[PDB]
Amino acid sequence: GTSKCRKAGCVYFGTPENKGFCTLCFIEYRENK
Amino acid sequence: MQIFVKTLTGKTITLEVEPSDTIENVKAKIQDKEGIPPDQQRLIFAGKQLEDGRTLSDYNIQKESTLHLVLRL
Ligand SMILES: [Zn+2]
């Protein structure tokens, strides 16, 4: 009922408070600037 | 929010959770309500086994969803 992860071909579901990423893609994002 | 955890035996358990909770957070909540070691726990959602370090939302698990508890034992 939500939205997939913003990243490439990610199998997981994103979330607004993570700029649209799943939790780990979001940490990856964050770690890279 | 809140979800249901169901053993194979039949025994059901209701858990109060947030979509932010990791699979470890949930295994921990079960160890509380049922004294099972999280290393024995294998959680399953709609046929997929839930991988450690990911969250409920990563799986699109929403309120009133049902996970099954399998055990390594
Ligand atoms: Zn992702």
Q: Under DSSP, is residue B41 helix (H, G, I), strand (E, B) or coil?
A: strand
Resolution of the experimental model, in Å, one decimal: 2.5
The span from the CA of A1 to the CA of A31, in Å, is 28
Residue of chain B minimizing CA distance to A17: B20
Q: Under DSSP, is residue B7 helix (H, G, I), strand (E, B) or coil?
A: strand
Question: Which residues lie below 8 Å from residue A28, measured CB to CB, with a gap of 6+?
Answer: A7, A21
Q: Which residues of B touch A13 (CB under 8 A)?
A: 57-60
According to DSSP, the residues that pair with B72 across neighbouring strands are: none
Contact B4, B12 (CB under 8 A): yes
Asked if A7 is an interface residue toward chain B (Cβ–Cβ < 8 A), one would say no
The answer to whether the CB atoms of A15 and B19 lie below 8 A apart is yes
C-alpha distances out from residue B72 to B14, B30, B35, Å: 22, 15, 15
Domains in chain B and their CATH numbers? Answer: 1-73 (3.10.20.90)
